[PDB]
Every structure is written in C-alpha cells, then in structure tokens.
C-alpha cells in the first residue's frame, strides 16, 4: 500500500493540509493503476529479449508511451535524476 | 462519514 508514502508527500507539498480516509483511498487507487499500466507496458517492451529484463530503459519508454506528453517529460526527468543520485 | 486517514 502507498498510503503512508502518499501521506509523507502530501506533508512536503501542503504541510498544513490533511486528507480524508476516502480521498486517500482514491490517491492509492491512482498510484496502483499507474504502477500496473507502467509494469504491463515495460513487460511488453522486455518481451522482445530472451531472459526478459526490465531496466530503467524499459521503464523510461513505458513512461513516454503511457503518460500524457508534459507529465511524461517531467516524470522522465524525475526518473533520470533519481537513478543519477542512486548511481553516483 | 469520512474520518481522517
């Protein structure tokens, strides 16, 4: 469940604003739905190779295909920064 | 009714 991680992010963006049980259920359904869309898409992309392998390249493509264009562009940049910070 | 998370 992403609810605790959604809560932590809510408190960085709106320190002084809370969230109802029903609203948090909606946020958590959004995140699960996107996860599955990106996972399914990355699964097709990786299906080309034997030993199907999902790397940051498959995720990056999956993001550029599934997300609307301006969301995709910001998400790709976020994805890239996080792998650069992890790597270095 | 919709209590705080």
């Amino acid at each position: 469940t992403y609810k605790i991680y959604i809560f932590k992010v809510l408190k960085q963006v709106h320190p002084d604003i809370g969230i109802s049980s029903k609203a948090m259920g909606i946020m958590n359904s959004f995140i699960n739905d996107i996860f599955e869309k990106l996972a399914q898409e990355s699964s097709k992309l990786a299906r080309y190779n034997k030993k199907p392998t999902i790397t940051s390249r498959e995720i990056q493509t999956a993001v550029r295909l599934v997300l609307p264009g301006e969301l995709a562009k910001h998400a790709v940049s976020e994805g890239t920064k996080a792998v650069t910070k992890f790597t270095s | 009714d919709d209590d705080d998370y």
Binding site: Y2, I17, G18, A23, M27, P52, I54, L71, G79, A82 | -
Partner: protein
Amino acid sequence: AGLQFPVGRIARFLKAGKYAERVGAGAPVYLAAVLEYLAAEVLELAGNAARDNKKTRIVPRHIQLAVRNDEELSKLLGDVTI
C-alpha cells in the same frame, strides 16, 4: 535517490507476476520516482482546491476537481466519481 516512495517491493512484485525474469537495479528507483512525481502533482492540485474552498483537509471532491481541471491528469487518470 532523494525519494519518499519505496524502491524495495518493486523487483519482487515484477518477478512474482512474471512481468520479467530479471529486473535491473535502476528500474525500481526510476519507477518509484515517477509514481512519487504523479502523487505529488495530484496532491498539490487537490490541496490547492481544499485551500481555495477554505478547507484544512482534502476530500474526494477536491481530487475530482483537481483531476477534472487538468487536461493531462483527466487523460491519465480518467473520471473521478464522488
């Protein structure tokens, strides 16, 4: 990686569903950062709607308003009911 979202469960979930036989170490980091980005976008807009309506908490109505007024979120997420 800077993130609040969890990198750990992703590789295990992908293997256990046979989404792939192998997962690179960058893939879960990338994916968690993307999910965190989208949560932050929705929350920021939902919270703005709460504040604009003089509320101190986000309720379903605020998320519905946030998604409905945003062309890309409406496309990605679909309709929000109640």
